[PDB]
Write a protein that binds this ligand. Structure first.
Ligand SMILES: *[C@@H]1O[C@H](CO)[C@@H](O[C@@H]2O[C@H](CO)[C@@H](O[C@H]3O[C@H](CO)[C@@H](O)[C@H](O)[C@@H]3O)[C@H](O)[C@H]2NC(C)=O)[C@H](O)[C@H]1NC(C)=O
Ligand SMILES: *[C@@H]1O[C@H](CO)[C@@H](O[C@@H]2O[C@H](CO)[C@@H](O[C@H]3O[C@H](CO)[C@@H](O)[C@H](O)[C@@H]3O)[C@H](O)[C@H]2NC(C)=O)[C@H](O)[C@H]1NC(C)=O
Ligand SMILES: *[C@@H]1O[C@H](CO)[C@@H](O[C@@H]2O[C@H](CO)[C@@H](O)[C@H](O)[C@H]2NC(C)=O)[C@H](O)[C@H]1NC(C)=O
Ligand SMILES: *[C@@H]1O[C@H](CO)[C@@H](O[C@@H]2O[C@H](CO)[C@@H](O)[C@H](O)[C@H]2NC(C)=O)[C@H](O)[C@H]1NC(C)=O
Ligand SMILES: *[C@@H]1O[C@H](CO)[C@@H](O)[C@H](O)[C@H]1NC(C)=O
Ligand SMILES: *[C@@H]1O[C@H](CO)[C@@H](O)[C@H](O)[C@H]1NC(C)=O
Ligand SMILES: *[C@@H]1O[C@H](CO)[C@@H](O)[C@H](O)[C@H]1NC(C)=O
Ligand SMILES: *[C@@H]1O[C@H](CO)[C@@H](O)[C@H](O)[C@H]1NC(C)=O
Ligand SMILES: [Ca+2]
Ligand SMILES: [Ca+2]
Ligand SMILES: [Ca+2]
Ligand SMILES: [Ca+2]
Ligand SMILES: [Cu+2]
Ligand SMILES: [Cu+2]
Lengths: 701, 705
């Protein structure tokens, strides 16, 4: 690995040592920080400048300094802010730059900071010790309440309030189900907690919700109940089935099919670079933005500088305040931070290579997520190509598709997002995103038809949309790229020969798109059938070397623009956009957007601003998603079938012929040959497997 | 009810029907393999599918099974008024009756020019071409393309310009050796009029050489001699893989191999497949291609039938062949052109392979060896999983393993790959890939509007691909309705803070009541959730549903103003839902191809102001894309990104995800040893899977002459 490798535990420790020195002892461990402390919230790789980086990979120039970016919580002060500090060079840091205002134009308001885990503990303490017992009347008759046992548990929602500067979060209450998902057991109560004060003692409950009704306080509710004005119904807290359990009641049977490598792995993983005979690339995770791939070279030629997840978004509907106002912008929690171990043989093939990831977040020392990535070759059991000739000449030639895959999974509370990077031997790249895990349920009460389906006894599966944003820094045969839109048209013409007759003449249409706005495509509008970035260079046949972007999405209608918060994820409105790549436009979102979408720290629509994309270094931005109306078959989990979205990058006249023609694994034989002869056909030479003992990456405390 | 009602005819059965017919068709019946236009012959013999009512009575209520019958297509050329007739023969295995159903189905006789072109006809055409026509230009040909054969002809789309025409444009190509002639068009195209019942009356209506039209082959020779023709010299031979299919690179370490550590987990018996979740029957129609029948998930039928109906390629170009090609492939026949699966390339090595039998343009059954494969595939992707670090520590998940049936139709150049994929969640996935060689034209003139140059002298002509599929869902029984659900945002005041506004996300539910309400043109928008449902409810009160999720990137359909568009009306619909009807068994016909202007079936007729509330409904799905060929399509189109089709996904059909009860799921709490066999079957894998089976020896199903 090297240039793009996430920071090592060693490097992380070094950056933290350096930070503990240059900041005013009285710096607290973020894992215990109160709002008014100072705090290292995160430390992670700071990605090199593109120009320096290429200089080093393509033209011998030495590597750009290796730096970290640290996000610090400055609450021990008259005007608290959040600061972004670059720290470097590594491995032995000597400087520390504050880029906060360079990037943002001013300080970062302190309410934009992510809720810390200690902040959650404190909210819980407030709820469970000071607020809930005031309703131990009601809660005994609906939800088996006790002392503080407790049987209940809370889950956060979306943005936290109704306008910039708010930090008030709606929480639902849930049975603390054991060994299975609590998410399906909303007990009916929702609390609007205002935790904006830096003194958690000034924290208040602004609103309460129970069975379709609102109250200004729990005591108010508890009173309405003692007055016999609130019909209570005792919600069971145990059960059987998928609703209550994830473990299967059926004895295991004969094993599922297993793939192995007869003559060993055909790719290697060194640090965080992957090389096969066809592909080399580096991979990693942003703490906040998650999966990323750099420096992808097919057969030594670079196709893409960067492909990375930008953001993941979930917009809910509901019967209830928590659900009806939820809009998660998941980078506010962090796709890398919340990445989880892969279970060997379930999350990936048993014989995949599994790699660890290290991080420093909300603590003062490095921690490791074991088995966070997997890399493997997968025989797709589908041919890449084949032709069987019975006509004029008797031959067969084809090649079975084997694919190279990098994967990790982020578990954002209930959801488990699966991120796939798939390298094809045709020179196509496939980026996929699947959502499994648990749905968010609401408590089923009142008229629920317009907001979801009943999916269990007391469980409303609430309607929502999922979407995700991808950065695609194609460098098609260099940096200077154009974008083409090709498509088709019928044109009625007379038949040349028989001009009395007509015919619909099918024609290709091509259009160069020269301005950003011309290549920004809104969800809901139609897009050209062929859409690619090209070089001015041509292939042997004189067509522009191109890579075409083909989208797999079933986009739901994006949050309408009139929303005060919509600019916190404006990329949701576009399917495809292509901009000039700028060093000051590294992401389309930010960890800070989540807690203030009303005053977005980054607003994607800014990137589309009347510049030229004709012969420039272009980056393309892809949105993919779908509507989800949960249904009974989402219990216990939603399945991955049919729910993969993303895109293909496919060569389009980039090469002079299909590269797989030169494949070591292709098969060919003529009728006149002995197809069963080892020399004619390597399929005829075929041919303990050796399984590593099973280990699991464990859990986090 | 235990009988294979949906099995394709066996050789014995085919032979049997052929014998019966031989007797009863009478004098001067000819083997169609050598038949002339004016002969009488049997073109095909295949299974007549039972009528549903009787079939279900047998399968569900245990009634006696309907008679097993065949349908034979007979070309009656030896008479005053030639006709093609459709005859039913049964009951198998010892047939005793035959009935002509032609008029019942089509309202009149089948005009003779609709018949597919016989292989003998192709052969005769070639004789007129190479023995009486091309020689008139031996001069040009000697100059331009190494004449003295060395050329092969290849047919095209509809044959003419009005109903009744049988004029085919034939392109000429270097007979290339051991690789595709398709890329080596030498620039000459002949418009052969082979309508005449006497092949000696067949003429050449027109000529086309490298950009120029000529009235005859003689006139072309004339001008070439008069020094009046600028001849482009196209090479005979080359090396590049627009010339070879054979990789010039030595075999490396072996690609991954899949195997079943503890024996297989499904079984194939005849045309029935069964595993612990699924049972269904499969086969090929000689013309319509792949079909699966009677699909049961854990004992419950979901679909009576899913079957390919038609496949369609619409070309553009500036040469007259490609400019006017609209292939309606059922006219060649997707079953008929099915090819053996190469073990290890077309399906996994350890798939189970299955032969297919047919009697087509012959008088004796033949067998395509290994026409089908069936296998479990480990997807390398979990079906579901959740890792909890929060409050309670556990992991629960299931690797997806899927059950596949595949066959491949090689129509000329194209290799179509058809997948039926059975998911453990209750979902069915239907896929269609095109691979093989593109069709090409001699590269000449103003090609940018018609494709990309793709090789020396080789223009990859632009075209669309479409396939139509029949999906006879019987959701919890025959009586089904269709629902369209979707979303909307309704702007309103935040209930607890009226100062503010929120965009309230809601679900939208519309019952679609008439066939037209459920027909959806290409390029119009479609309900994000479209499903067929019972009025029966699942445990939670929602109608039991199967939803149809389409994966298509459709091209613009051929414009309706085209006199021939009625021959593939289905192309203009993405999705339509219709009342199932015994008289509407297919959306296309083997006969639409050679007269699309007078279609034998017009799919649009099925859509005609009838209720679809509470009836036996059948859905029809169209899937396809635009293809602008390009360098990477040489030697072949690759299958990546080319998959097109649809899923049938359960939607409140069950009470909960059936996969919760899977025998293969994995679960363990934080407080257990995930490394212990008693907690986790995966732990056992090493020690009881250091046992890979001996592979069977490689064999190939052969080629055919
Ligand atoms: C956000 O908070 C930061 C600290 O709370 C702040 O950076 C700090 O800025 C102060 C002065 O603005 C610097 O303190 C320095 O003050 C004396 C002058 O008497 C200087 O000579 C010394 O350099 C001394 O340390 C801090 O160095 C600095 N802390 C760090 C880590 O940079 C930011 O200015 C605040 N951000 C904005 C935009 O307001
Ligand atoms: C389409 O083509 C068929 C011609 O081969 C034709 O079927 C044949 O029709 C005749 C009468 O319709 C039948 O032959 C009959 O000849 C004597 C006359 O002395 C009759 O009295 C007898 O009934 C005798 O059978 C043929 O048997 C019959 N062949 C079969 C297999 O059906 C069709 O009628 C033509 N139909 C169309 C729609 O025009
Ligand atoms: C076209 O070229 C092919 C060359 O592959 C010819 O195929 C061979 O034909 C000979 C007889 O002349 C046979 O004995 C061989 O078995 C054939 N070889 C293969 C691999 O099929 C073919 O004759 C030529 N056909 C035409 C119409 O030109
Ligand atoms: C919620 O319930 C869970 C029970 O599953 C509790 O988690 C356990 O905590 C006990 C001690 O209190 C441990 O000894 C167990 O090993 C834990 N279980 C595992 C497998 O994670 C927990 O007390 C409750 N937490 C909350 C917030 O109420
Ligand atoms: C493409 O553009 C750059 C100049 O801006 C040039 O260096 C390169 O060689 C060009 N190639 C062409 C037009 O063939
Ligand atoms: C877009 O760009 C051109 C400058 O090249 C500028 O003159 C034009 O006014 C711009 N349009 C807008 C709306 O800013
Ligand atoms: C389904 O609807 C038909 C109404 O035409 C009715 O006869 C049948 O009883 C209904 N069943 C249910 C369960 O609603
Ligand atoms: C379509 O359906 C209804 C009958 O239920 C009728 O009123 C309407 O006029 C019909 N139109 C037709 C068949 O032309
Ligand atoms: Ca770029
Ligand atoms: Ca810009
Ligand atoms: Ca039906
Ligand atoms: Ca109808
Ligand atoms: Cu969802
Ligand atoms: Cu194509």
């Amino acid at each position: 690995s090297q240039l793009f490798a996430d920071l090592s535990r060693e490097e992380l420790t070094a950056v933290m040592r350096f930070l503990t020195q240059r900041l005013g002892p009285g710096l607290v461990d973020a894992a215990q920080a109160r709002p008014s402390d100072n705090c290292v919230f995160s430390v992670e790789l700071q990605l090199p400048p593109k120009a320096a980086a290429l200089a080093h990979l393509d033209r011998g120039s030495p590597p750009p300094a290796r730096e970290a970016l640290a996000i610090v919580f400055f609450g021990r002060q008259p005007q608290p802010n959040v600061s972004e500090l670059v720290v470097g060079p590594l491995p032995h840091p000597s400087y520390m730059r504050d880029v906060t205002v360079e990037r943002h134009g001013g300080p970062l308001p302190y309410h934009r900071r992510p809720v810390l885990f200690q902040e959650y503990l404190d909210i819980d303490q407030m709820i469970f010790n000071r607020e809930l017992p005031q309703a131990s009347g009601l809660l005994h008759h609906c939800c088996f309440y006790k002392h503080r046992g407790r049987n209940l548990v809370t889950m956060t929602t979306a943005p936290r309030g109704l306008q910039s500067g708010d930090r008030a979060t709606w929480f639902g209450l849930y049975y603390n189900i054991s060994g299975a998902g609590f998410f399906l057991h909303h007990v009916g109560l929702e609390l609007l907690v205002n935790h904006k004060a830096l003194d958690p003692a000034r924290w208040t409950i602004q609103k309460v919700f129970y069975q379709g009704r609102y109250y200004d306080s729990l005591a108010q509710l508890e009173a309405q109940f003692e007055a016999g004005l609130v019909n209570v119904v005792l919600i069971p807290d145990n059960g059987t089935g998928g609703s209550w359990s994830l473990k299967s009641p059926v004895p295991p049977g004969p094993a599922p099919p297993l793939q192995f490598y007869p003559q060993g792995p055909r790719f290697s993983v060194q640090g965080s670079r992957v090389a096969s005979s066809l592909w080399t690339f580096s991979f990693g995770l942003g703490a906040f933005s998650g999966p990323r791939i750099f420096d992808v070279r097919f057969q030594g030629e670079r196709l893409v500088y960067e492909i990375s997840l930008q953001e993941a978004l979930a917009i809910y509907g509901g019967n209830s305040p928590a659900a009806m106002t939820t809009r998660y912008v998941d980078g506010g929690f962090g796709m890398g931070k919340y990445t989880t171990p892969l279970t060997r043989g379930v999350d990936c093939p048993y014989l995949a290579t599994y790699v660890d990831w290290h991080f420093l977040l909300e603590s003062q020392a490095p921690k490791t997520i074991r088995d966070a990535f997997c890399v493997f070759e997968q025989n797709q059991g589908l041919p890449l190509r084949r032709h069987h000739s019975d006509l004029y000449s008797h031959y067969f030639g084809g090649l079975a598709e084997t694919v190279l895959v990098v994967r990790s999974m982020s578990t954002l509370l209930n959801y488990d997002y699966v991120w796939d990077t798939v390298f094809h031997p045709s020179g196509a790249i496939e980026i996929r995103f699947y959502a499994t895990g648990y749905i968010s349920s609401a408590f089923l009460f009142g008229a629920t038809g317009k907001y979801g389906n009943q999916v269990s006894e007391h469980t409303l599966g609430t309607v929502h949309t999922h979407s995700a944003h991808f950065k695609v820094d194609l460098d098609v045969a260099g940096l200077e790229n154009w974008v083409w839109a090709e498509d088709m048209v019928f044109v009625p013409m007379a038949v040349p020969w028989s001009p009395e007759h007509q015919l619909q003449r099918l024609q290709v249409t091509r259009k160069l798109l020269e301005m950003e706005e011309q290549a920004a495509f809104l969800v809901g509008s139609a897009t050209p059938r062929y859409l690619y970035l090209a070089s001015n260079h041509s292939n042997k046949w004189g067509h522009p070397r191109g890579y075409r972007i083909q989208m797999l999405s079933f986009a739901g209608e994006p949050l309408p623009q009139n929303s005060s918060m919509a600019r916190g994820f404006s990329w949701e409105r576009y399917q495809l956009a292509v901009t000039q790549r700028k060093e000051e436009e590294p992401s389309s979102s930010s960890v800070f957007n989540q807690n203030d979408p009303w005053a977005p720290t980054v607003d994607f629509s800014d990137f589309i601003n009347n510049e030229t994309i004709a012969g420039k270094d272009l980056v393309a931005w892809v949105t993919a998603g779908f509507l989800h109306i949960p249904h009974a078959e989402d219990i216990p989990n939603t399945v991955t079938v049919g729910n993969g979205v993303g895109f293909f990058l496919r060569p389009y006249n980039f090469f002079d012929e299909d590269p797989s023609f030169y494949s070591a694994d292709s098969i060919y034989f003529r009728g006149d040959q002995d197809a069963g002869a080892c020399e004619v056909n390597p399929l005829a030479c075929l041919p303990a497997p050796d399984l590593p003992a099973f280990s699991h990456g464990g859990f986090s405390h």
